[PDB]
Amino acid sequence: MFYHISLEHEILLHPRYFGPNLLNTVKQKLFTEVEGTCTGKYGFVIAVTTIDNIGAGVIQPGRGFVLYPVKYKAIVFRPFKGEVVDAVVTQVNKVGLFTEIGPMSCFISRHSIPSEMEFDPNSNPPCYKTMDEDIVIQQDDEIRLKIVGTRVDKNDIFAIGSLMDDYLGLV
Amino acid sequence: KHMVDDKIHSRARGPIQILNRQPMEGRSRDGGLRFGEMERDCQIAHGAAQFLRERLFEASDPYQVHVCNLCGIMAIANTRTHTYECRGCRNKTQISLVRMPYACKLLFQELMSMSIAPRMMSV
Amino acid sequence: EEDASQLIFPKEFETAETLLNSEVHMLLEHRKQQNESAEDEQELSEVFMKTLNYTARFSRFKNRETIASVRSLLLQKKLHKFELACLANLCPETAEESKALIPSLEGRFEDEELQQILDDIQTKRS
Amino acid sequence: YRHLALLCDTMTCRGHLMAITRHGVNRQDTGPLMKCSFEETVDVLMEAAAHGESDPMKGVSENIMLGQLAPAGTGCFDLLLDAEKCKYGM
Amino acid sequence: IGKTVTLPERRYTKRDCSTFLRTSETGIVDQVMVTLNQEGYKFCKIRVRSVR
Amino acid sequence: REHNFQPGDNVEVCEGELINLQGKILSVDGNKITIMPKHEDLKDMLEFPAQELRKYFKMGDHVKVIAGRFEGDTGLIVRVEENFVILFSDLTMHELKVLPRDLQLCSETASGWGELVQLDPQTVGVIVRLERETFQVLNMYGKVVTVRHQAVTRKKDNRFAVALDSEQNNIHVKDIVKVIDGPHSGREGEIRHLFRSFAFLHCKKLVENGGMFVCKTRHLVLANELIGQTVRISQGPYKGYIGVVKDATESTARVELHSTCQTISVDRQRLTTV
Amino acid sequence: SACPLRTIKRVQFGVLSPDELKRMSVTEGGIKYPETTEGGRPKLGGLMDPRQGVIERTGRCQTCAGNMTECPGHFGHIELAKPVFHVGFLVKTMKVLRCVCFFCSKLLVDSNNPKIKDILAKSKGQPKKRLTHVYDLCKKNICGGCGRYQPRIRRSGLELYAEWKKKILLSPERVHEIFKRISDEECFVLGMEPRYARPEWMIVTVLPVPPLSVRPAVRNQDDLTHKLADIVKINNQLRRNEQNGAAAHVIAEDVKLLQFHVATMVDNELPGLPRAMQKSGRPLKSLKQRLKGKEGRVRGNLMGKRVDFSARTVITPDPNLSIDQVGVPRSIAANMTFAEIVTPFNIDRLQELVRRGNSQYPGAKYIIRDNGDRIDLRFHPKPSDLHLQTGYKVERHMCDGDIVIFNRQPTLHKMSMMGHRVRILPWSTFRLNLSVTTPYNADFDGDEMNLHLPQSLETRAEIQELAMVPRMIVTPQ
Amino acid sequence: KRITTPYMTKYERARVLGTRALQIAMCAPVMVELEGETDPLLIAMKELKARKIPIIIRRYLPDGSYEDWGVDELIISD
RNA sequence: GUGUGUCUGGGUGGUGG
Ligand SMILES: [Mg+2]
Ligand SMILES: [Zn+2]
Ligand SMILES: [Zn+2]
Ligand SMILES: [Zn+2]
Numbered sequence A: 001m002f003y004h005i006s007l008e009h010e011i012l013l014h015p016r017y018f019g020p021n022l023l024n025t026v027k028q029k030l031f032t033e034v035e036g037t038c039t040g041k042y043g044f045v046i047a048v049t050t051i052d053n054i055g056a057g058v059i060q061p062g063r064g065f066v067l068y069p070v071k072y073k074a075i076v077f078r079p080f081k082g083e084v085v086d087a088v089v090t091q092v093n094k095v096g097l098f099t100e101i102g103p104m105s106c107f108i109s110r111h112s113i114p115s116e117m118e119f120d121p122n123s124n125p126p127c128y129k130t131m132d133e134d135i136v137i138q139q140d141d142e143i144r145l146k147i148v149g150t151r152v153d154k155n156d157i158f159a160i161g162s163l164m165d166d167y168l169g170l171v
Numbered sequence B: 001k002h003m004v005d006d007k008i009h010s011r012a013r014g015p016i017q018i019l020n021r022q023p024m025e026g027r028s029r030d031g032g033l034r035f036g037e038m039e040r041d042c043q044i045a046h047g048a049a050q051f052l053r054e055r056l057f058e059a060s061d062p063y064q065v066h067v068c069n070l071c072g073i074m075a076i077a078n079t080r081t082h083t084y085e086c087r088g089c090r091n092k093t094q095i096s097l098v099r100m101p102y103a104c105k106l107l108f109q110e111l112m113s114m115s116i117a118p119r120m121m122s123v
Numbered sequence C: 001e002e003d004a005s006q007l008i009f010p011k012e013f014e015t016a017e018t019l020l021n022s023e024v025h026m027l028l029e030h031r032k033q034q035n036e037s038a039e040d041e042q043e044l045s046e047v048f049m050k051t052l053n054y055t056a057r058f059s060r061f062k063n064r065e066t067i068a069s070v071r072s073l074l075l076q077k078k079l080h081k082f083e084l085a086c087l088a089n090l091c092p093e094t095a096e097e098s099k100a101l102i103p104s105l106e107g108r109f110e111d112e113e114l115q116q117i118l119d120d121i122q123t124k125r126s
Numbered sequence D: 001y002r003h004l005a006l007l008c009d010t011m012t013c014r015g016h017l018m019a020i021t022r023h024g025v026n027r028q029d030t031g032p033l034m035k036c037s038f039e040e041t042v043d044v045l046m047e048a049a050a051h052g053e054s055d056p057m058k059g060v061s062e063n064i065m066l067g068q069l070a071p072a073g074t075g076c077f078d079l080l081l082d083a084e085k086c087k088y089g090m
Numbered sequence E: 001i002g003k004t005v006t007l008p009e010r011r012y013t014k015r016d017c018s019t020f021l022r023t024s025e026t027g028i029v030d031q032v033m034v035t036l037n038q039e040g041y042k043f044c045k046i047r048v049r050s051v052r
Numbered sequence F: 001r002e003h004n005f006q007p008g009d010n011v012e013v014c015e016g017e018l019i020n021l022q023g024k025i026l027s028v029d030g031n032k033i034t035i036m037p038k039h040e041d042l043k044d045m046l047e048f049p050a051q052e053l054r055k056y057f058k059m060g061d062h063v064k065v066i067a068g069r070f071e072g073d074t075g076l077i078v079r080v081e082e083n084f085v086i087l088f089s090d091l092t093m094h095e096l097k098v099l100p101r102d103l104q105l106c107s108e109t110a111s112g113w114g115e116l117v118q119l120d121p122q123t124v125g126v127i128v129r130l131e132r133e134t135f136q137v138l139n140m141y142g143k144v145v146t147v148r149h150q151a152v153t154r155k156k157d158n159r160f161a162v163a164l165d166s167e168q169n170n171i172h173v174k175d176i177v178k179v180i181d182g183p184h185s186g187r188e189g190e191i192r193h194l195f196r197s198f199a200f201l202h203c204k205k206l207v208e209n210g211g212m213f214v215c216k217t218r219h220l221v222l223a224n225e226l227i228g229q230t231v232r233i234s235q236g237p238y239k240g241y242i243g244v245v246k247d248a249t250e251s252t253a254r255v256e257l258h259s260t261c262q263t264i265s266v267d268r269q270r271l272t273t274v
Numbered sequence G: 001s002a003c004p005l006r007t008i009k010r011v012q013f014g015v016l017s018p019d020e021l022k023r024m025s026v027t028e029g030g031i032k033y034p035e036t037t038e039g040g041r042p043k044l045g046g047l048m049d050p051r052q053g054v055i056e057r058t059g060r061c062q063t064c065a066g067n068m069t070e071c072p073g074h075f076g077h078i079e080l081a082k083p084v085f086h087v088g089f090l091v092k093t094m095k096v097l098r099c100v101c102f103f104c105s106k107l108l109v110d111s112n113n114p115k116i117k118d119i120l121a122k123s124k125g126q127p128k129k130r131l132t133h134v135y136d137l138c139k140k141n142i143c144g145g146c147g148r149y150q151p152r153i154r155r156s157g158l159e160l161y162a163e164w165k166k167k168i169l170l171s172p173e174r175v176h177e178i179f180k181r182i183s184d185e186e187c188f189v190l191g192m193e194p195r196y197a198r199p200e201w202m203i204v205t206v207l208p209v210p211p212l213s214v215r216p217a218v219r220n221q222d223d224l225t226h227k228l229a230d231i232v233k234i235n236n237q238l239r240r241n242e243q244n245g246a247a248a249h250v251i252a253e254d255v256k257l258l259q260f261h262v263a264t265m266v267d268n269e270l271p272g273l274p275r276a277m278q279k280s281g282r283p284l285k286s287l288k289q290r291l292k293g294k295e296g297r298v299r300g301n302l303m304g305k306r307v308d309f310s311a312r313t314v315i316t317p318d319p320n321l322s323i324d325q326v327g328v329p330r331s332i333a334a335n336m337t338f339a340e341i342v343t344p345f346n347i348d349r350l351q352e353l354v355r356r357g358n359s360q361y362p363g364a365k366y367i368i369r370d371n372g373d374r375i376d377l378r379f380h381p382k383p384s385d386l387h388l389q390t391g392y393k394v395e396r397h398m399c400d401g402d403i404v405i406f407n408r409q410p411t412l413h414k415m416s417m418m419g420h421r422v423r424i425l426p427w428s429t430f431r432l433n434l435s436v437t438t439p440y441n442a443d444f445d446g447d448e449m450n451l452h453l454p455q456s457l458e459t460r461a462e463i464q465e466l467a468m469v470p471r472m473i474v475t476p477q
Numbered sequence H: 001k002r003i004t005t006p007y008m009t010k011y012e013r014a015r016v017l018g019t020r021a022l023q024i025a026m027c028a029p030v031m032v033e034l035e036g037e038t039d040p041l042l043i044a045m046k047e048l049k050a051r052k053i054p055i056i057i058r059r060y061l062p063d064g065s066y067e068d069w070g071v072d073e074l075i076i077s078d
Numbered sequence I: 001g002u003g004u005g006u007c008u009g010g011g012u013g014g015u016g017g
Helices: A023-032 B036-044 B049-058 B103-113 C011-015 C021-036 C044-056 C064-074 C081-090 C095-100 C111-124 D001-008 D033-039 D041-051 D060-064 G018-024 G087-099 G116-124 G127-138 G172-180 G184-190 G224-245 G248-266 G286-294 G298-301 G330-335 G347-356 G434-440 G457-466 H010-025 H041-049
Strands: A002-011 A066-075 A084-090 A095-101 A105-109 A142-147 B010-012 B033-035 B061-068 B076-078 B083-085 B095-101 B119-120 D078-081 E004-006 E014-016 E028-036 E040-050 F010-012 F022-024 F062-064 F072-075 F117-118 F123-128 F135-137 F141-145 F177-179 F198-202 F212-217 F220-222 F230-233 F241-247 F252-257 F262-269 F272-273 G011-014 G074-085 G152-156 G159-165 G168-170 G204-209 G305-307 G310-317 G325-328 G337-341 G364-368 G374-378 G393-397 G403-409 G417-424 G430-432 G448-452 H057-058 H068-069
Touching: A002 C011, A023 B036, A023 F252, A066 D041, A084 C044, A084 C081, A105 A142, B010 C011, B010 G330, B033 G074, B036 B049, B036 G298, B036 G417, B049 B095, B049 G305, B061 B076, B061 B103, B103 G204, B103 G286, B103 G298, C021 C044, C021 C081, C021 E014, C064 C081, C064 C111, C064 F241, C081 C095, C081 C111, C081 D001, C095 C111, C095 F123, C095 F220, D033 D041, D033 D060, D033 G298, D041 G127, D060 G298, D078 H010, F022 G116, F062 G417, F123 F135, F212 G286, G011 G403, G018 G074, G018 G204, G074 G172, G074 G224, G074 G248, G087 G152, G087 G159, G087 G248, G116 G127, G116 H041, G127 G184, G168 G172, G298 G305, G310 G330, G325 G403, G330 G417, G337 G364, G347 G393, G403 G457, G417 G434, G417 G457, G430 G434, G457 H041, G457 H057, H010 H041, H010 H057
Parallel strands: G310 G430, G325 G417
Antiparallel strands: A002 A066, A084 A095, A084 A142, A095 A105, B010 G310, B033 G305, B061 B095, B076 B083, B119 G011, D078 H057, E004 E014, E028 E040, F010 F022, F062 F072, F117 F123, F135 F141, F177 F220, F198 F212, F230 F241, F230 F272, F241 F252, F252 F262, G074 G204, G152 G159, G159 G168, G310 G448, G325 G430, G337 G393, G364 G374, G364 G393, G403 G417, G403 G448, H057 H068
16 A cells, blocks of 8 residues: 555746756645645655655757656555555445545445444434444544455546455454 | 739738648638748758748647557547547556647548558657 | 455556555654745645544554564565555454455465464564 | 768668669668658558558658657757756846 | 528528628729529629729 | 447356356447457456346446436446445435446446526526536526527627625636635635626535525625728828728727728727718 | 647557457447438438547537547448458558468468578568568478468459469458468568568458548538448448348459449559549549648648748848848738747837737737637737736737748748848838849749748747858858 | 767757747746846847856767757857 | 637639749
8 A cells, every 4th residue: 555666757847947946946846746646546645755866857849848857756545456454434324334544535335244234324323333332333433444446537536445354343 | 914912911820721720722712821842941951940840830730639658549538528548458548648730640540541550659 | 457365566566665554654744744844835735634644543653663673573574565564554363363354365374473473563562 | 072972972872872763762761751751652651551660750851740840950959957057046 | 792591490590601802902892783694593793993 | 128238348157167257348249249358367268148148347447327317427336236236426425226227338427517508698507417418507596407509599608797796806707706604605616607696606516415506696705889980080191081990999990991902090089980 | 638748759650450440440330321411410320420520610529528629530440241452552462472371371481491591580670671582582382281382363453363373263351361370470570560560451351431530521521431431332232232132243243342442442543443433523532642642641731831920922122121131011010920928028018019909010919828828909808808917928010120031932942041130111022132132043023932930939049040141141052 | 978079059059049038038037147138039149158058958979878068068159 | 798600622724933
């Protein structure tokens, strides 16, 4: 999940920043641009504290801008299959369970769960709650769940989680 | 019968041909002048490569198509829905916008119609 | 197309080195601290602090010395870095639970040795 | 003399007498797009398609057709921003 | 010459197909004739005069 | 009946020693396909047709709803059963379950906003659904009304729309504004509406309840005639010359002189009409 | 545009594979209906499929959501009932056919042989040359494999006759069958790339159809669409005849006519064969005719093309100008424009130029803002629009001192087009110093001249540093 | 080791003047005291005489390598 | 209390430098 992986980004820089603080402007622009991406594969980015090198500044012909190819190790936000991660829940719907990992809005289907857990709509907080309160799946509690699927829709990072395995949660 | 008033002509930006997007022909149709082959030869003789590039590509028929990086075929681009698909090699990510003359796109499309695959790559 | 049970990764993601939940917690804390030490920066995004407090809730350790020590001990055996970080963030109560958690572990490590290292990391837990 | 010499050398640099025709110029490995620009465009392009010939885009003619800055006079080099020299600015 | 053609199918029941003077040319209209062509439709000729 | 199987749909095998193998359709044929799909790490080629096979999309992908109540919606389904299929869609937050017959990868897309159309010469509207088969446009009273491209009589938007409020603010086309009161007011909005007393609030989110609202503008807060006339130049160097004005501005005008081929630009103070 | 912009380092050529064409075409199931429309509704699967491109102005595509300018058109395909020889690759088809075995479908000379390996090693590196020597040495009779003697292949128009010396008409099905089972290594040593040019791909089992951009319409129709209509009509007739009639002679005649139609779609200059002559009394203009001519596509639109920002008027003498100066009429200067980038240095001057408007000559025409939008000054916009800010671009008219390239045809030598400085003058002729009449070979007996206004400051600077009249008084010839 | 000529060609000068003019046009900071000249091209020529153009020229050798030369490192044609 | 569609495609002939 948290991989210290090199990431390549291209900086298009206006000539107004061709001053004594040119490279500082390059770094600031990279920090402002790269953060918060919701592309299908790479997703959210954590690379403020790390830079490998800044490539040479190639002046594009016919355009005032300049290309600064910057290499740097980065932390990616990508989906995967067949592994289980510590998770904390968010607001839960009636039949579908919404859990959250970082900013990623994970989802869980109803009948995929083992029968020791069932929804109780008569409960005051609408959330996945067991009758005996053995494990309560509600907002802001520690749980465990696996992820197998990947999802993209108009560059909105999405995924579906599963909890077919038992014994997971406060473990 | 020849006067200057029947021969003076100027054009900045106006109508274009339908098939290729280059400017039209003639001053009756307000078409602009042909930067012919020998003009290109004279401009490379100058070495004014930027002026030649502007005249041929930029001043006549600028265009840009999205092309897949794996196979050099132009990819479907839906810019407003912000998705770019190279349907044919199962690619949705390795898509690159490439600036070319409209006549070059036209030529490559007829070559594709002739079963030739003008696979263009940035590699 | 990616699968964890066979421990198959893409070409790019394979060569990367995985870092623990406490490691990203420490790096996020350092990034936030130097953000407080920054030269008049703009307001940060919700995604950053959301991930930061999620890592804070997932945290099991707080001192860097123990992190360095556990990183030193966990590379001794041929335990892949993804399942290494998974075990560090999870830390179940027995070897069978780890085996049922990550299905790649099954066969690679015996139950006795796996229970030994699990008990060791549980004793080192503070 | 330079232009005469350059003509003679160009048409005798391949050992045989390279006639300035369809028959000499289009037999060299200059690239499919330059040859198609010169003469018998369809024949050259179909032969290239059959033989998988690739154009490395090193000539002026190919880049001209593709609209890219030619390797000619003002395009035979790159310009790099001297970031250190920009530190003297104000 | 003001000429409009009807459309097969509001604000825009017709399409304007008027003929305009040539863009670079000016002058004084000096002779306008209206007559009928070979097959009976209306047919006009307009002579424009330009002192050079 | 008909066998309407679409490429991009996944199938599952029931019989044989090749049970529960899912592969992506790569070609389509009439009734007998003998397809060679890409199963999960299968080193053997299977040629089996689509007659017995059933349309089940794979794990975690996105599908589209063609028929049913969610007509034209993109759904994401994770369920392996014969008569129970569950989705979380984007148009609908309240969770209902849709039948697999109305699930395929058709090109109906309900992910969309703000497109301007005209219903009256003065009154305009904001569309909510962007589809080729149902053009549903909102109306300020809190309903949804269907329209069509040929029934709308499109008029070019005039960019002189300056909506104004009672808090003495100043706002124009493509501006963000707020309101002190409202259930889901107080968010980012793009204002492009041609009127003075009402202004629509814009959201690109879910369009059922929490993506549209409007209230009266009392509560909003911040953040030519001379063409063709025959004129006589009664002043200046060109005095007495006769012409017809072609281009007339507030200050100057362009005059088509009758006596010469030149068309001069003269101030309107030196122009006297006939 | 969220995709990374980049140049083209190389262009690989090849032959589109039939399966690649099938999975590339937007027309799933192929084009089956010759009719272009149904009661005015553009018929899907016809020759004006809305998925292929954009039907009309202010219309949107279906494959993409681009408009007429945005959409670069998308391809369709026709699945052919029977294959046909691609007339373009015909000679290549004969050469590969004679190189390989008719029955064994193997190379007539085995690649495993050490002496033959040495022979091809002398020629490794060049595909066409390797194929040429392979053809030259086979020009053998018997294969190793089966010892059946190969036939002699001959062409009569479009069909192929295989003469054993039973002369049979070699159908394209048989050629496709032969080429299908040739190995990739055999293909490589044969002189064809197996990745890009497999032997079975020249025979046309799937015919691509271009987008509507290649074959536009007004309600006139491009002749390319007419040929496509003929091809698909013949193809549907062939499909029905195979399904129902199944008579060999009518099948053969229909296949011959199908070959003729696809060939005439590609090349309409076959000797002996009839011209694809339309009902209008006009011969066709095929794809080969589109590409080959001087007025065609390469020489007519790629190498040299019509340009904007150009002027032409007769030239008259003017001894008062300098050699590097050129007289320019007021109307010509007022018509074309040079896009000036707004700076705080010239904000006041450019604001005045904007205020003066396009009506008065020393004014402007457009204002390209920082967002890429341009506003016309002929439409008299509100002064809030006319407020200039730094970074905007103002298309002021051509003022004095502007650098122009001044060209006279025929453009013989380097001095035939030269940089000149603009001086505004009353009357309607360009003016030249009498000294520059010699490099241009220009007289003043009605000579016209072509002016070119470089649009970017980079182009202006390079013309100023390279092509000005003083800089090129001395010629290298 | 740089083996290309220390002189700066007319093509190098034309290109560097053009791009420096384009940069000064969109408000890149100047590198010379301005007497008051307005158009970017004359200002760029002034920087050229001052040898204060902050652009590295990468001359591409036919063997595929290159040689980076600063404008200050080269010698003016005039 | 506004605003873009400008009959294409061939052929023939004459003409200017
Ligand atoms: Mg002459
Ligand atoms: Zn591709
Ligand atoms: Zn399209
Ligand atoms: Zn054989």
